[PDB]
Design a protein around this ligand. Structure first.
Ligand code: 3S0
Ligand code: 3S0
Ligand code: ZN
Ligand code: ZN
Ligand code: ZN
Ligand code: ZN
Lengths: 239, 230
């Protein structure tokens, strides 16, 4: 029962300290929890995607130990090798577990800017850098063999480096910490945010994946496209 | 722009009724966390419900009161032993303000990192404050609804207004969860939320610690979320 983040409901599997929810035949959401003394636990969500005989991960958990638990869940429930992970910006909820991925021998990818920022936050860069076109689409040569992961940089918003991921062959897109849920009272932590460009970036994510009906995000349960439009409307108020 | 109106220094004030204002203060951690309390004008004096998160913020509340109302602050009632409600006790005491809390809040206070109030409120089995422990409370009607967000949580209605204050017990009607349940009584929470509603059956404006004022649907929704904890 986290203080911040969705609660457990039917469909969820508790595994160690984490929760897993199947979203599609080949897509699961991982959820891990950071305890803040005096405040309680904060949930963060990422994705696990099966692509034939391999698995792809989006985001670490908050810590190495929690991230190793994700890998243990994958071993138990899927029993296929993890080919690569993509992490969606240089904050602890998304990149706190890089060492566990590296120890397991998993190739890691992040926005070049996230890799440049990571050490400034005490964290470990991904081993490979993604770069983007002027319209936000990832440069394909930087994202080799990504299978159904369609990476899109929507512009600065929650952070300047935030990226998003569509899951090709499904109706799911992942907004990470850029997108908040359709009932959210606020845009979360704006400490590293670009308040001028946020609204346009949220809308750009929606336009990049115009047919995604299930929007997955870091700190609330999967939602409708109203998460994207509500996020953009909250962001409009920041300018 | 907290992670979780009149600006005055680091605080925000909102008038809810001719003699009632909501105070809001922010704890920067992750980002800033808002907490709300109340300021009430009665009979030439001001009564405060809850401190801000810190002594300095609470001193700013007293300064706002000086500038906007300019009447003596007679007493404060604080609604449980957590930082959002009791973090500023020293500032109230320095200013000569008499402070009141549930006896249990005062006993938990040091263990929770808080300075105890000067006076202890006690309660009947039905939840209503024992009158002799709450002298000169004016329109404040203090009710202990049972364990919920914490075992010590109390609530406050304002007679002659449409307002009741649920503090951290009550969450808003659109809330996804009950906030921090680390110190909560998950078995009794739903009954306690319902007891608050029944204690203040007339109140149409429900004020709470971590959301803007809401309708009575906040009570109903909070109880229903709490039913699920059992
Ligand atoms: C380097 O990052 N350090 C983190 C961290 O990852 N914080 C992130 C952030 O602040 O952007 C998390 N992400 C957030 C987000 O809006 O995406 C918020 C979520 O917290 C809530 N309740 O919104 C704060 S917690 C941290 C320290 C303590 C809690 O989080
Ligand atoms: C002793 O209290 N220490 C506090 C504190 O006041 N915490 C309170 C609590 O945990 O109940 C606050 N109250 C809460 C509540 O549900 O009433 C939550 C609100 O935080 C959120 N966004 O739910 C966490 S912050 C604290 C320490 C560090 C941050 O807050
Ligand atoms: Zn972030
Ligand atoms: Zn985040
Ligand atoms: Zn509390
Ligand atoms: Zn609280």
């Amino acid at each position: 029962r986290p203080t911040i983040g969705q609660q457990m409901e039917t469909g969820d599997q508790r595994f160690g300290d984490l929760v897993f929810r199947q979203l599609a035949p080949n897509v699961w959401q991982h959820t891990s929890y950071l305890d803040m003394p005096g405040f309680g636990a904060v949930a963060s969500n990422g994705l696990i995607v099966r692509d034939g005989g391999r698995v792809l991960v989006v985001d670490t958990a908050w810590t190495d130990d929690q991230t190793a638990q994700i890998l243990n869940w994958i071993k138990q429930e899927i029993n296929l090798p993890v080919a690569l992970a993509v992490v969606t910006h240089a904050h602890q909820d998304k990149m706190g577990g890089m060492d566990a991925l590296h120890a397991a021998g998993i190739a890691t990818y992040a926005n070049a800017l996230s890799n440049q920022l990571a050490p400034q936050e005490g964290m470990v860069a991904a081993q490979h850098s993604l770069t983007f076109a002027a319209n936000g689409w990832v440069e394909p040569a930087t994202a080799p063999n990504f299978g159904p992961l369609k990476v899109f940089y929507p512009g600065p918003g929650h952070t300047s480096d935030n990226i998003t991921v569509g899951i090709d062959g499904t109706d799911i897109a992942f907004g990470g910490c850029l997108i908040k849920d359709s009932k959210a009272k606020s845009l979360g932590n704006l400490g590293d945010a670009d308040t001028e460009h946020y609204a346009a970036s949220a809308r750009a994510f929606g336009a990049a994946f115009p047919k995604a009906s299930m929007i997955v995000m870091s700190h609330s349960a999967p939602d409708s496209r109203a998460a994207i439009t509500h996020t953009a409307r909250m962001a409009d108020k920041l300018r």
